[PDB]
Coordinates of C-alpha atoms in Angstrom, one line a residue:
Chain A
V1 CA -166.8 -73.2 -76.2
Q2 CA -166.5 -69.6 -77.3
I3 CA -168.3 -66.4 -76.2
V4 CA -167.9 -63.4 -78.6
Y5 CA -169.1 -60.4 -76.6
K6 CA -169.0 -57.5 -79.1
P7 CA -171.9 -55.0 -78.5
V8 CA -171.6 -51.9 -80.7
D9 CA -173.0 -48.5 -79.6
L10 CA -173.2 -45.7 -82.2
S11 CA -176.0 -43.7 -80.3
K12 CA -176.4 -40.0 -80.3
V13 CA -178.1 -38.7 -77.1
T14 CA -178.6 -34.9 -77.3
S15 CA -180.2 -31.8 -75.8
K16 CA -181.0 -28.7 -77.9
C17 CA -182.8 -26.2 -75.7
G18 CA -183.2 -22.5 -75.1
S19 CA -183.1 -20.1 -78.1
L20 CA -181.5 -21.9 -81.1
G21 CA -181.1 -20.9 -84.8
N22 CA -183.8 -18.2 -84.7
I23 CA -183.7 -15.2 -87.0
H24 CA -184.6 -11.7 -85.6
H25 CA -184.6 -9.4 -88.6
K26 CA -185.0 -5.6 -88.0
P27 CA -186.9 -5.8 -84.6
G28 CA -188.3 -2.7 -82.9
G29 CA -191.1 -0.1 -82.8
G30 CA -191.3 3.2 -84.7
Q31 CA -191.8 5.8 -81.9
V32 CA -192.3 5.2 -78.2
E33 CA -193.0 8.3 -76.0
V34 CA -193.8 8.7 -72.2
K35 CA -194.7 12.1 -70.9
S36 CA -195.6 13.0 -67.2
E37 CA -195.1 15.6 -64.5
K38 CA -193.5 12.8 -62.4
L39 CA -192.6 9.1 -62.7
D40 CA -192.5 7.5 -59.2
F41 CA -191.5 3.8 -58.7
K42 CA -191.1 2.6 -55.1
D43 CA -191.1 -1.3 -54.4
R44 CA -190.0 -4.2 -56.8
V45 CA -191.2 -2.2 -59.9
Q46 CA -190.0 -3.5 -63.4
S47 CA -190.4 -0.9 -66.2
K48 CA -189.6 -1.3 -69.9
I49 CA -190.0 1.6 -72.3
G50 CA -189.1 1.0 -76.0
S51 CA -186.4 -1.6 -75.0
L52 CA -185.9 -5.0 -76.6
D53 CA -185.1 -8.1 -74.4
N54 CA -183.9 -11.5 -75.7
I55 CA -183.8 -13.6 -72.5
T56 CA -183.1 -17.4 -72.1
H57 CA -183.1 -19.5 -68.9
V58 CA -182.1 -23.2 -69.1
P59 CA -182.0 -24.9 -65.7
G60 CA -183.0 -28.1 -67.6
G61 CA -181.4 -29.6 -70.7
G62 CA -179.1 -32.2 -68.9
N63 CA -178.3 -35.7 -70.4
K64 CA -177.7 -39.1 -68.6
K65 CA -176.3 -42.3 -70.2
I66 CA -175.7 -45.5 -68.1
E67 CA -174.5 -48.8 -69.4
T68 CA -173.7 -52.1 -67.5
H69 CA -171.9 -54.5 -70.0
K70 CA -171.7 -57.5 -67.5
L71 CA -170.4 -60.9 -68.6
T72 CA -170.1 -64.0 -66.4
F73 CA -168.9 -67.6 -67.2
Chain B
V1 CA -170.9 -74.4 -78.5
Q2 CA -170.8 -70.6 -79.3
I3 CA -172.6 -67.5 -78.1
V4 CA -172.1 -64.5 -80.5
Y5 CA -173.4 -61.6 -78.4
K6 CA -173.3 -58.6 -80.8
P7 CA -176.2 -56.1 -80.1
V8 CA -176.0 -53.0 -82.4
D9 CA -177.3 -49.7 -81.2
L10 CA -177.9 -46.8 -83.7
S11 CA -180.4 -44.8 -81.5
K12 CA -181.0 -41.1 -81.8
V13 CA -182.5 -39.8 -78.5
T14 CA -183.1 -36.0 -78.6
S15 CA -184.7 -33.0 -77.0
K16 CA -185.6 -30.0 -79.1
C17 CA -187.5 -27.5 -76.8
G18 CA -187.7 -23.7 -76.1
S19 CA -187.6 -21.4 -79.2
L20 CA -186.1 -23.0 -82.3
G21 CA -185.7 -22.1 -85.9
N22 CA -188.3 -19.2 -85.6
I23 CA -188.3 -16.2 -88.0
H24 CA -189.2 -12.8 -86.5
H25 CA -189.2 -10.4 -89.5
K26 CA -189.7 -6.7 -88.7
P27 CA -191.5 -7.0 -85.3
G28 CA -192.9 -3.8 -83.6
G29 CA -195.7 -1.2 -83.4
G30 CA -195.9 2.2 -85.3
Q31 CA -196.4 4.7 -82.5
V32 CA -196.9 4.1 -78.7
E33 CA -197.6 7.1 -76.5
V34 CA -198.4 7.4 -72.8
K35 CA -199.4 10.8 -71.4
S36 CA -200.3 11.6 -67.7
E37 CA -199.8 14.0 -64.8
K38 CA -198.2 11.1 -62.8
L39 CA -197.2 7.4 -63.3
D40 CA -197.0 5.9 -59.8
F41 CA -196.0 2.2 -59.2
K42 CA -195.7 1.0 -55.6
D43 CA -195.6 -2.9 -55.0
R44 CA -194.5 -5.6 -57.6
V45 CA -195.8 -3.7 -60.7
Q46 CA -194.6 -4.9 -64.1
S47 CA -194.9 -2.2 -66.9
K48 CA -194.2 -2.6 -70.6
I49 CA -194.6 0.4 -73.0
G50 CA -193.7 -0.3 -76.7
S51 CA -191.0 -2.9 -75.7
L52 CA -190.4 -6.3 -77.3
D53 CA -189.7 -9.4 -75.1
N54 CA -188.6 -12.7 -76.5
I55 CA -188.5 -14.9 -73.4
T56 CA -187.6 -18.6 -73.1
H57 CA -187.6 -20.8 -69.9
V58 CA -186.6 -24.5 -70.3
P59 CA -186.5 -26.3 -66.9
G60 CA -187.5 -29.5 -68.9
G61 CA -185.8 -31.0 -72.0
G62 CA -183.7 -33.6 -70.1
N63 CA -182.7 -37.0 -71.4
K64 CA -182.0 -40.4 -69.8
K65 CA -180.8 -43.6 -71.5
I66 CA -180.1 -46.8 -69.5
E67 CA -178.9 -50.2 -70.9
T68 CA -178.0 -53.5 -69.2
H69 CA -176.1 -55.7 -71.7
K70 CA -175.9 -58.7 -69.3
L71 CA -174.7 -62.2 -70.5
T72 CA -174.4 -65.3 -68.3
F73 CA -173.1 -68.9 -69.1
Chain C
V1 CA -162.5 -72.1 -74.1
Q2 CA -162.2 -68.5 -75.3
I3 CA -164.0 -65.3 -74.2
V4 CA -163.6 -62.4 -76.7
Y5 CA -164.8 -59.3 -74.9
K6 CA -164.6 -56.4 -77.4
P7 CA -167.5 -53.9 -76.9
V8 CA -167.2 -50.9 -79.2
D9 CA -168.5 -47.4 -78.1
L10 CA -168.6 -44.6 -80.7
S11 CA -171.5 -42.7 -78.9
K12 CA -171.9 -39.0 -78.7
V13 CA -173.6 -37.5 -75.6
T14 CA -174.1 -33.7 -76.0
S15 CA -175.7 -30.5 -74.7
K16 CA -176.4 -27.4 -76.8
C17 CA -178.2 -24.9 -74.6
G18 CA -178.6 -21.2 -74.0
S19 CA -178.5 -18.9 -77.1
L20 CA -176.8 -20.8 -80.1
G21 CA -176.6 -19.9 -83.8
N22 CA -179.2 -17.1 -83.7
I23 CA -179.1 -14.1 -86.1
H24 CA -180.0 -10.7 -84.8
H25 CA -179.9 -8.4 -87.9
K26 CA -180.2 -4.6 -87.2
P27 CA -182.3 -4.7 -83.9
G28 CA -183.7 -1.5 -82.3
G29 CA -186.5 1.1 -82.2
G30 CA -186.7 4.4 -84.2
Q31 CA -187.2 7.0 -81.4
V32 CA -187.7 6.4 -77.7
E33 CA -188.4 9.5 -75.5
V34 CA -189.2 9.9 -71.8
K35 CA -190.1 13.4 -70.4
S36 CA -190.9 14.4 -66.8
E37 CA -190.2 17.1 -64.2
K38 CA -188.8 14.3 -61.9
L39 CA -187.9 10.5 -62.2
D40 CA -188.0 9.0 -58.7
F41 CA -187.0 5.3 -58.3
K42 CA -186.3 4.1 -54.7
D43 CA -186.4 0.3 -53.9
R44 CA -185.6 -2.7 -56.2
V45 CA -186.8 -0.8 -59.3
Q46 CA -185.5 -2.1 -62.6
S47 CA -185.8 0.4 -65.5
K48 CA -185.0 0.0 -69.3
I49 CA -185.4 2.9 -71.7
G50 CA -184.5 2.2 -75.4
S51 CA -181.9 -0.5 -74.5
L52 CA -181.1 -3.9 -76.0
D53 CA -180.5 -6.9 -73.8
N54 CA -179.3 -10.3 -74.9
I55 CA -179.2 -12.3 -71.7
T56 CA -178.6 -16.1 -71.1
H57 CA -178.6 -18.2 -67.9
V58 CA -177.6 -21.9 -68.2
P59 CA -177.4 -23.4 -64.7
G60 CA -178.5 -26.7 -66.3
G61 CA -177.0 -28.4 -69.5
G62 CA -174.8 -30.9 -67.6
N63 CA -173.8 -34.4 -69.0
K64 CA -173.3 -37.8 -67.2
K65 CA -171.8 -41.0 -68.6
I66 CA -171.4 -44.3 -66.7
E67 CA -170.1 -47.6 -68.1
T68 CA -169.3 -50.8 -66.0
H69 CA -167.4 -53.3 -68.2
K70 CA -167.4 -56.2 -65.7
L71 CA -166.1 -59.7 -66.8
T72 CA -165.9 -62.8 -64.6
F73 CA -164.6 -66.4 -65.2
Chain D
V1 CA -182.5 -3.9 -177.1
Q2 CA -182.2 -0.9 -174.7
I3 CA -183.0 -1.0 -171.0
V4 CA -183.1 2.1 -168.7
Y5 CA -183.4 1.0 -165.1
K6 CA -183.7 4.5 -163.5
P7 CA -185.9 4.4 -160.4
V8 CA -185.6 7.6 -158.3
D9 CA -186.1 7.4 -154.5
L10 CA -186.7 10.7 -152.7
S11 CA -188.6 9.1 -149.7
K12 CA -188.2 10.0 -146.0
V13 CA -188.8 7.5 -143.2
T14 CA -188.9 9.2 -139.8
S15 CA -189.7 8.3 -136.2
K16 CA -190.5 11.1 -133.7
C17 CA -191.0 9.6 -130.2
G18 CA -191.0 10.9 -126.6
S19 CA -191.2 14.6 -125.4
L20 CA -190.6 16.7 -128.6
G21 CA -191.2 20.5 -129.0
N22 CA -193.0 21.1 -125.6
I23 CA -193.0 24.5 -123.8
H24 CA -192.9 24.3 -120.0
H25 CA -193.3 27.9 -118.7
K26 CA -192.8 28.6 -114.9
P27 CA -193.5 24.9 -113.9
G28 CA -193.7 24.7 -110.1
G29 CA -193.7 28.4 -109.0
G30 CA -196.1 27.7 -106.1
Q31 CA -195.8 26.6 -102.4
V32 CA -195.3 23.0 -101.3
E33 CA -195.3 22.3 -97.5
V34 CA -194.8 18.8 -96.0
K35 CA -194.9 18.7 -92.2
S36 CA -194.4 15.1 -91.1
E37 CA -194.1 13.7 -87.5
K38 CA -194.2 10.3 -85.8
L39 CA -194.3 8.0 -88.9
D40 CA -193.1 4.4 -89.2
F41 CA -192.2 2.6 -92.6
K42 CA -191.6 -1.2 -92.6
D43 CA -191.0 -1.6 -96.4
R44 CA -189.5 0.3 -99.4
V45 CA -190.4 4.1 -99.7
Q46 CA -190.3 6.1 -103.0
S47 CA -191.0 9.9 -102.4
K48 CA -191.1 13.0 -104.6
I49 CA -191.8 16.4 -103.0
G50 CA -191.7 19.5 -105.3
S51 CA -189.6 17.6 -107.9
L52 CA -189.2 18.5 -111.6
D53 CA -186.4 16.1 -112.9
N54 CA -186.1 15.7 -116.7
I55 CA -185.5 11.9 -117.1
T56 CA -185.1 10.6 -120.7
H57 CA -184.5 6.9 -121.5
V58 CA -184.3 5.5 -125.1
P59 CA -183.3 1.8 -125.4
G60 CA -185.0 2.0 -128.9
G61 CA -184.7 4.6 -131.6
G62 CA -182.2 2.6 -133.7
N63 CA -182.5 2.4 -137.5
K64 CA -181.8 -0.5 -139.8
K65 CA -181.4 0.0 -143.6
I66 CA -180.8 -3.0 -145.9
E67 CA -181.0 -2.5 -149.7
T68 CA -179.5 -4.9 -152.3
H69 CA -178.7 -4.3 -156.0
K70 CA -178.0 -7.0 -158.6
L71 CA -177.8 -6.9 -162.4
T72 CA -177.5 -10.3 -164.2
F73 CA -176.6 -10.4 -168.0
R74 CA -177.1 -13.8 -169.7
Chain E
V1 CA -177.7 -4.4 -176.3
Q2 CA -177.5 -1.3 -174.1
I3 CA -178.3 -1.5 -170.3
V4 CA -178.3 1.6 -168.1
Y5 CA -178.7 0.6 -164.4
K6 CA -178.8 4.1 -162.9
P7 CA -181.1 4.0 -159.7
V8 CA -180.9 7.2 -157.7
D9 CA -181.3 7.1 -153.9
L10 CA -181.7 10.5 -152.2
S11 CA -183.8 9.1 -149.3
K12 CA -183.4 9.8 -145.6
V13 CA -184.0 7.4 -142.7
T14 CA -184.2 9.3 -139.4
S15 CA -184.8 8.7 -135.8
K16 CA -185.7 11.5 -133.3
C17 CA -186.3 9.7 -129.9
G18 CA -186.1 11.2 -126.4
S19 CA -186.4 14.8 -125.2
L20 CA -185.8 17.0 -128.2
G21 CA -186.3 20.8 -128.8
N22 CA -188.3 21.4 -125.5
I23 CA -188.2 24.8 -123.6
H24 CA -188.1 24.7 -119.8
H25 CA -188.5 28.3 -118.6
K26 CA -188.0 29.0 -114.8
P27 CA -188.8 25.4 -113.6
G28 CA -188.7 25.4 -109.8
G29 CA -189.0 29.1 -108.9
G30 CA -191.4 28.3 -106.0
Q31 CA -191.0 27.3 -102.4
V32 CA -190.6 23.7 -101.1
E33 CA -190.5 23.1 -97.3
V34 CA -190.1 19.7 -95.7
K35 CA -190.2 19.6 -91.9
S36 CA -189.6 16.0 -90.8
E37 CA -189.3 14.8 -87.2
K38 CA -189.4 11.4 -85.3
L39 CA -189.5 9.1 -88.4
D40 CA -188.4 5.4 -88.7
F41 CA -187.6 3.5 -92.0
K42 CA -186.8 -0.3 -91.9
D43 CA -186.2 -0.7 -95.7
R44 CA -184.8 1.2 -98.8
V45 CA -185.7 4.9 -99.2
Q46 CA -185.6 6.9 -102.4
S47 CA -186.3 10.6 -101.8
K48 CA -186.4 13.7 -104.1
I49 CA -187.1 17.1 -102.6
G50 CA -187.0 20.1 -105.0
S51 CA -184.8 18.2 -107.5
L52 CA -184.5 19.1 -111.2
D53 CA -181.8 16.7 -112.5
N54 CA -181.4 16.2 -116.3
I55 CA -180.8 12.5 -116.7
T56 CA -180.3 11.0 -120.2
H57 CA -179.8 7.4 -121.0
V58 CA -179.5 5.9 -124.6
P59 CA -178.6 2.1 -124.8
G60 CA -180.3 2.3 -128.3
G61 CA -180.0 4.9 -131.1
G62 CA -177.5 2.6 -133.1
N63 CA -177.5 2.6 -136.9
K64 CA -177.0 -0.4 -139.2
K65 CA -176.6 0.2 -143.0
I66 CA -176.1 -2.8 -145.3
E67 CA -175.5 -2.5 -149.0
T68 CA -174.8 -5.3 -151.6
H69 CA -174.0 -4.5 -155.3
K70 CA -173.3 -7.2 -157.8
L71 CA -173.0 -7.4 -161.6
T72 CA -172.8 -10.8 -163.3
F73 CA -171.9 -11.1 -167.0
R74 CA -172.4 -14.5 -168.7
Chain F
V1 CA -173.0 -5.0 -175.8
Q2 CA -172.8 -2.0 -173.4
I3 CA -173.5 -2.0 -169.7
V4 CA -173.5 1.1 -167.5
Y5 CA -173.9 0.1 -163.8
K6 CA -173.9 3.7 -162.3
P7 CA -176.2 3.6 -159.2
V8 CA -176.1 6.9 -157.2
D9 CA -176.5 6.9 -153.4
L10 CA -176.7 10.3 -151.6
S11 CA -179.1 8.9 -148.9
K12 CA -178.5 9.6 -145.2
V13 CA -179.3 7.3 -142.2
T14 CA -179.4 9.4 -139.0
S15 CA -180.1 8.9 -135.3
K16 CA -180.9 11.7 -132.8
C17 CA -181.5 10.1 -129.4
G18 CA -181.4 11.4 -125.8
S19 CA -181.6 15.1 -124.8
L20 CA -181.0 17.4 -127.9
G21 CA -181.6 21.1 -128.4
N22 CA -183.5 21.8 -125.2
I23 CA -183.4 25.2 -123.4
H24 CA -183.3 25.2 -119.6
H25 CA -183.7 28.8 -118.5
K26 CA -183.1 29.7 -114.8
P27 CA -184.0 26.2 -113.4
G28 CA -184.0 26.1 -109.6
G29 CA -184.1 29.9 -108.8
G30 CA -186.6 29.0 -105.9
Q31 CA -186.3 28.1 -102.2
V32 CA -185.8 24.5 -100.9
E33 CA -185.8 24.0 -97.1
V34 CA -185.3 20.6 -95.4
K35 CA -185.5 20.6 -91.6
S36 CA -184.9 17.1 -90.4
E37 CA -184.6 15.7 -86.8
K38 CA -184.8 12.4 -84.9
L39 CA -184.8 10.1 -87.9
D40 CA -183.8 6.4 -88.1
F41 CA -182.9 4.5 -91.4
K42 CA -182.1 0.7 -91.3
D43 CA -181.5 0.2 -95.0
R44 CA -180.1 2.1 -98.1
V45 CA -181.1 5.7 -98.6
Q46 CA -180.9 7.6 -101.9
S47 CA -181.6 11.4 -101.4
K48 CA -181.6 14.4 -103.7
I49 CA -182.3 17.8 -102.2
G50 CA -182.2 20.8 -104.6
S51 CA -180.1 18.9 -107.2
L52 CA -179.8 19.8 -110.9
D53 CA -177.2 17.3 -112.2
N54 CA -176.6 16.7 -115.9
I55 CA -176.0 12.9 -116.2
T56 CA -175.5 11.4 -119.7
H57 CA -175.1 7.7 -120.5
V58 CA -174.7 6.3 -124.0
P59 CA -173.9 2.5 -124.3
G60 CA -175.6 2.6 -127.7
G61 CA -175.2 5.2 -130.6
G62 CA -172.8 2.9 -132.5
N63 CA -172.8 2.7 -136.3
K64 CA -172.2 -0.4 -138.5
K65 CA -171.8 0.0 -142.3
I66 CA -171.4 -3.0 -144.5
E67 CA -170.6 -2.7 -148.2
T68 CA -170.1 -5.4 -150.8
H69 CA -169.3 -4.7 -154.5
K70 CA -168.5 -7.5 -157.0
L71 CA -168.2 -7.7 -160.8
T72 CA -168.0 -11.2 -162.3
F73 CA -167.2 -11.6 -166.1
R74 CA -167.5 -15.1 -167.8

């Protein structure tokens, strides 16, 4: 008798996520103007005037690998 | 008698998700103008004036791989 | 009898997430102007005027590997 | 025998090209106003306002002369 | 036998290429006003305001003269 | 036998290229105003305001003269 247990694993298991390899070339507007007597913001207001945001959230993107190389005679 | 147990794994398992390999070449408007007596924002208002957002959320994109290389005589 | 238990693992398990390998070439607007008699922000207000944000959250992206090389005569 | 090979060449070969012999008397002299506000340009701009440059370019205007004389006797 | 080989060349080969013999009398002399505010340019700008440069370029204008005289006797 | 090989060359090969013999009398002599505020440039700018530069470039204008005289007897 002989048993020759030689499994080979060469696997790649990968996550690529969020903002990857993008090109942002000269972003932005010409003129932005806001004119008022008053600007009045009073509960959970978000305001953006002529600003640029690059924003990435990755709560995902995880990897799992499980192997059970059992042998029994 | 012989058992020659030699499974070969070459697998690529991949996630590519979100914003990937994009080109954003000279984004933006010419002129944006807002004029008023008052701007008045008072509960959960979101305001965007001439701004650029690039925004990526990836709660997904996960990987699982499971293998059970069992042998029994 | 002989048992020749020689599994080979050359696997890569990997995460690439958030902001990776992006190019941001000369970002920003020309002119941004805000004019008022008063600016009045009073509860959980967020304000952005002509600013650039690169912002990344990665609470995800984790890796797990399990192997169980059990042998029994 | 007698031979008298006596050609006479008084010719002129001339090239006159470009801006020759012009009179430009009080060019400009008036009023140019450009008022310009709140403009955006995403690509190349070339602009001339009230300009009077004298730009001269001559990659050509070269001359070639080849002439060739031979006398053969017997 | 008498041979007189007496060609006469008094010719002229001339080139006059470019800006030659012009008169420019009071160029400019006027009034150029640019008022510029709140402008954005994302790519190359070339601008001339009230300019009068004299720019001269001559990659050409070369001369090539080739002569070849030969007398062969017997 | 008599041979008189007596060619006469008084010819001239001439090049006049570029800016020659021009009169520039009181160029400029006017008013140039640039008022300029709140401008943004993201790429190369070339600007000339009220300039009158004399720029001359001559990669050419070279002369080649080749002569060859030979007398062969018997």
